[PDB]
């Protein structure tokens, strides 16, 4: 229920085989998300790993669940959708014809 | 070695050193580091300069 990068590098400071196991535990969608932001050396780790996934204990996944549920912040209302883009393009559609010139120029300049 | 003296000189005292200040400075860092990376939600790197 998280953010993509934020739980990258999350899982990013820990063991591989760790990284591969919560990917495992987590959902496709999110997993494809996480393993497109890492590096090229641990993005192939992890898929080696993940390719060579035997099974964890219980013991060691309840103590990883724990140890997640630790490293947890103030994730309550993460995120909001509030505008950006859509919003720019309808204050620019309300600016003047001259400022709107300005505009063209400025957005192309970037 | 003798010099003229002048009211708005001044020298250094030799070296100081203080490792317990800089273990305190690096236990400080660590825990800077994890509240920052929990408030601005994103991993921090904190180096400690040279005392």
Known sequence: ?110 | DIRPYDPNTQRRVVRERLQALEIINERFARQFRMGLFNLLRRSPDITVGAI
């Open chain 1, 1 to 110: 229920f998280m953010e993509p990068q934020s739980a990258a590098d999350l899982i990013r400071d820990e063991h591989p085989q760790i990284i591969a196991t919560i990917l495992v535990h987590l959902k496709r969608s999110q997993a494809a998300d996480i393993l497109a932001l890492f590096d090229e050396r641990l993005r192939h780790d992890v898929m080696l790993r993940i390719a060579t996934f035997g099974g964890v204990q219980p013991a060691a996944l309840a103590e990883l669940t724990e140890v997640l549920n630790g490293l947890l912040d103030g994730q309550n209302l993460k995120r909001s959708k509030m505008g950006g883009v859509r919003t720019a393009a309808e204050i620019i559609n309300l600016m003047k014809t001259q400022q709107e010139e300005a505009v063209i120029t400025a957005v192309r300049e970037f």
